[model samples]
Target: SRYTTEFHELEKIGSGEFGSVFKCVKRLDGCIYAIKRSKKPLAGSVDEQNALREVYAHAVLGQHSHVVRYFSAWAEDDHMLIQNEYCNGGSLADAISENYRIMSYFKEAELKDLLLQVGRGLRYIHSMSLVHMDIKPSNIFISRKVMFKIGDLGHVTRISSPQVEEGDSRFLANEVLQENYTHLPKADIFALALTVVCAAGAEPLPRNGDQWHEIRQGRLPRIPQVLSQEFTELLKVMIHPDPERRPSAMALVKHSVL
Candidate 1:
């Protein structure tokens, strides 16, 4: 509903699936926004559909604190540009790195907070029958207020027969590793749990190793023992071997710790 004429490009943000994102500030309100531009040669092209995929997803979800908000989108020269919130605090991936650099780690309380915020967003996604296939730290952006907001909306797909082939293998649920991989909302429940454990340990999850094998079996790979028993139990259920056993994101949001 808006155009680029009202905003000046501050700089390029980062690369995305369809095109590059740019950091820009609105002239009228001086508000910072992440402007994304992609090409759709023909409106009938699948490439056309995929070009503004995230925009459609954002349009449905609307505004939520723990979810990145989309302000507006416009077209120019057959290119799609979407304006979204610029998470100044950067990704949770970057936050972990910063903490590690200072010899500090996210506290248990912090983990609960993280789980709650992102839990709400993920719950909302599931409520819409959409699954965020990519739920890694890098895909989770943090606001200046230390609020966790799920990013990479382009990876979202319908609950059934999700486009599951395109996410970090380390965080991929065990069920996803199978030959006839089935799509379930629980896959996202599993992925978010791994990301939480990653924040707790200040380390990245495994790719493939004896540890990864253990993880494929629903074990929390190298989960820190320092976390309390109750907390660990909660974590265990989320990453449980049986997708049916895993709590839904909404259930996690209602959990006592949160």
Candidate 2:
């Protein structure tokens, strides 16, 4: 692998149980990228296969404006490494925190744009029969031009797979949290609505508490009334108890509220 000499590490952007992200400058073309290397090396382990799955997912879903761009992926010293677009604007989680600190809110127009962008991305993913099981704010990245993109394909799995998984707890739908449901596009739709709630300036919902249970039970979060009635109503059905009631990303992109 040319990973060593071809790239210069700038700073560590983020790290989690899955892996660590480094902002690196590529010497080949002098372009910066966010590089994610699995926390566990791709050796003889179950986690090893998972890391490979991430790169394969990106390889298949290439170059969408609303999807994180994967430039390349390879193994270096047994560790899986992936090069992706570096979003200078950080993540939607960062945006929400900054806006919350400043007492600012996302205007209705901006929220609509967010829904449209992510909806388009999800539609593309679901079209390939892959479910993005994780859809929290941190997985939605913002880059130049205020663009929002769906990211972290590491959590994705084919719709045919019956997954017994638990991603981030904050935005899981009842069926997913309850553990009997099939992972599908509807699962991401539920998380997307919760994300929109935070983008509307609500703080991240509790990991566990009354509000968490309420959401898992399929009650909508307390959306800010400042949003138009139409938008608020849409979020309601987006998080509806029945997964079938939730709008598909393809259908959501055509919704009037968006």
lDDT of 2 by residue, 17-126 (tens): 76889999999899999998875463676675566566777877878888889888777775778889999989998888888789787898998889889988999998
- Model 1 lDDT per residue over 179-253, tens place: 334646788888888899888873567788888888767676665538888988888888888888998887788
For model 1, which pairs clash? none
Q: Which ranges of candidate 1 are over 4 A from the true structure?
A: 1-4, 13-19, 37-52, 74-80, 160-165, 179-183, 223-225
Q: How accurate is candidate 1 locally (lDDT)?
A: 0.79
Clashes (candidate 2): 0
Model 2: residue 116 alpha-carbon error in angstroms: 1.0
How many clashes in each structure? 0, 0
